[PDB]
Amino acid sequence: MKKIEAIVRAEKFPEVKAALEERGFYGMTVTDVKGRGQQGGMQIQFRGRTMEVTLLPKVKLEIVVKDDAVEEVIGLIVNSAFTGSPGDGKIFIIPVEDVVRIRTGERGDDSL
Amino acid sequence: MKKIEAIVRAEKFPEVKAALEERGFYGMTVTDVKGRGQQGGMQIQFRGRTMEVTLLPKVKLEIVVKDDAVEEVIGLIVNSAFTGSPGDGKIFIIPVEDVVRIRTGERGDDSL
Amino acid sequence: MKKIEAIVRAEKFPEVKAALEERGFYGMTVTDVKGRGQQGGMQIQFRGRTMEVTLLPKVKLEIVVKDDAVEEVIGLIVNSAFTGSPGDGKIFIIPVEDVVRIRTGERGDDSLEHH
Ligand SMILES: Nc1ncnc2c1ncn2[C@@H]1O[C@H](COP(=O)(O)OP(=O)(O)OP(=O)(O)O)[C@@H](O)[C@H]1O
Ligand SMILES: Nc1ncnc2c1ncn2[C@@H]1O[C@H](COP(=O)(O)OP(=O)(O)OP(=O)(O)O)[C@@H](O)[C@H]1O
Ligand SMILES: Nc1ncnc2c1ncn2[C@@H]1O[C@H](COP(=O)(O)OP(=O)(O)OP(=O)(O)O)[C@@H](O)[C@H]1O
Numbered sequence: 001m002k003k004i005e006a007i008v009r010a011e012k013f014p015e016v017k018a019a020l021e022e023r024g025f026y027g028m029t030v031t032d033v034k035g036r037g038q039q040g041g042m043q044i045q046f047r048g049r050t051m052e053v054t055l056l057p058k059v060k061l062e063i064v065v066k067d068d069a070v071e072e073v074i075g076l077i078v079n080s081a082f083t084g085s086p087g088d089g090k091i092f093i094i095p096v097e098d099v100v101r102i103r104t105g106e107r108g109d110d111s112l
Numbered sequence: 113m114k115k116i117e118a119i120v121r122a123e124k125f126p127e128v129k130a131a132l133e134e135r136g137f138y139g140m141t142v143t144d145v146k147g148r149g150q151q152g153g154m155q156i157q158f159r160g161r162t163m164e165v166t167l168l169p170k171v172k173l174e175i176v177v178k179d180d181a182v183e184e185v186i187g188l189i190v191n192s193a194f195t196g197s198p199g200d201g202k203i204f205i206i207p208v209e210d211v212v213r214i215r216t217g218e219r220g221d222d223s224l
Numbered sequence: 225m226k227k228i229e230a231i232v233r234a235e236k237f238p239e240v241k242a243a244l245e246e247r248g249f250y251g252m253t254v255t256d257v258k259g260r261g262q263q264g265g266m267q268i269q270f271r272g273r274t275m276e277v278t279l280l281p282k283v284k285l286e287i288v289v290k291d292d293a294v295e296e297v298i299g300l301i302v303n304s305a306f307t308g309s310p311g312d313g314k315i316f317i318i319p320v321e322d323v324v325r326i327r328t329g330e331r332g333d334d335s336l337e338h339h
């Protein structure tokens with residue numbers, strides 16, 4: 001099993017959620033985060049008026065899935081989160097050694 | 113060492129925190145998140161107009177512990193977070209390769 | 225690749241961000257979190273009833289970098305986040321098996337800059 005952690009634009013997140021649900025990926029945890037990327041470099045200026053590059057709001061999605069589903073999930077998120085402009089985000093694939101379902105105590109892919 | 117990431121009901125979280133503390137697991141990081149599970153399937157209705165399944169508030173607990181403490185901490189969270197209804201949450205066990213204590217630079221199980 | 229997850233004081237986060245940026249680490253994801261550590265033990269004093277130890281606001285920084293950058297980034301965070309009091313934070317190094325750039329679909333060696 002792997003944890004897929006994707007940082008996506010808030011405007012794209014509804015489309016990412018719907019693309020996952022259509023393919024039966026219902027379990028997901030979402031956090032409001034802020035981030036920056038390469039765009040902007042060290043500093044910006046406008047006016048002005050020189051400023052740090054701003055940490056701007058993004059949506060973090062975490063979805064833990066079976067190893068065989070990882071590339072399907074990655075593509076569903078990429079196709080739905082993409083816009084073509086800097087700031088579209090990244091997806092990190094993190095190993096998960098086990099999962100426990102709190103309601104029943106079930107572990108393993110069973111737990112997903 | 114392992115990172116234990118548990119998504120639990122907000123109403124149960126204070127019981128989880130107290131169960132951990134009673135056994136001397138004091139360090140922990142908590143985030144307000146939103147999530148859905150399998151309950152609801154692809155969509156719901158009510159007096160609609162069908163509606164998406166709502167992402168609802170949950171609490172994310174992250175606790176990094178030595179490997180020999182993982183099973184104990186999983187039991188403390190399962191017992192304290194349980195209600196028996198869908199939405200009780202899941203626990204993910206994620207490998208950690210190292211830990212550093214910022215105050216002193218100490219690494220390894222020592223840093224915990 | 226590794227995910228470096230650091231929990232630091234909010235007062236020090238601007239210095240951490242500046243330290244990273246000065247060395248060219250620009251990609252980062254930050255979350256407001258709350259935490260406690262060992263300080264306070266099982267309960268606090270006042271008044272005159274006991275109170276639980278409070279979960280207080282912190283800043284969580286996640287930065288994913290190539291393996292050859294991990295020690296550099298750790299030192300940049302420790303040296304900018306340090307104050308010398310309990311509550312300074314911890315850094316967790318977590319394996320990452322792959323990274324995908326959404327804009328381009330690149331992965332692996334092409335998904336993070338070489339620093
Ligand atoms: N190395 C990283 N570690 C942690 N989070 C990152 C990293 N890189 C990007 N992110 C997150 O992804 C969000 C969008 O980053 P992205 O890489 O799309 O922007 P960019 O570098 O400006 O774009 P591009 O590479 O297309 O020019 C960031 O605001 C941050 O939340
Ligand atoms: N595969 C997953 N990946 C990430 N987060 C998940 C996943 N499954 C559940 N969660 C998180 O756990 C919370 C509770 O999910 P839970 O699994 O308890 O719900 P359910 O599937 O409806 O019920 P149950 O598993 O008892 O049948 C979710 O709202 C979400 O935050
Ligand atoms: N084992 C842990 N797992 C997850 N988060 C932790 C853990 N230990 C500390 N943290 C996070 O780091 C923050 C600061 O904790 P820190 O360890 O610096 O405090 P302390 O234990 O009181 O101090 P000291 O270690 O210097 O005595 C916590 O509030 C929490 O957010």
Ligand SMILES: [Cl-]
Nearest residue numbers: 094206227318
């Ligand atoms: Cl993680």
Ligand SMILES: [Mg+2]
Nearest residue numbers: 037038039251
């Ligand atoms: Mg980038």
Ligand SMILES: [Mg+2]
Nearest residue numbers: 027149150199
């Ligand atoms: Mg479930």
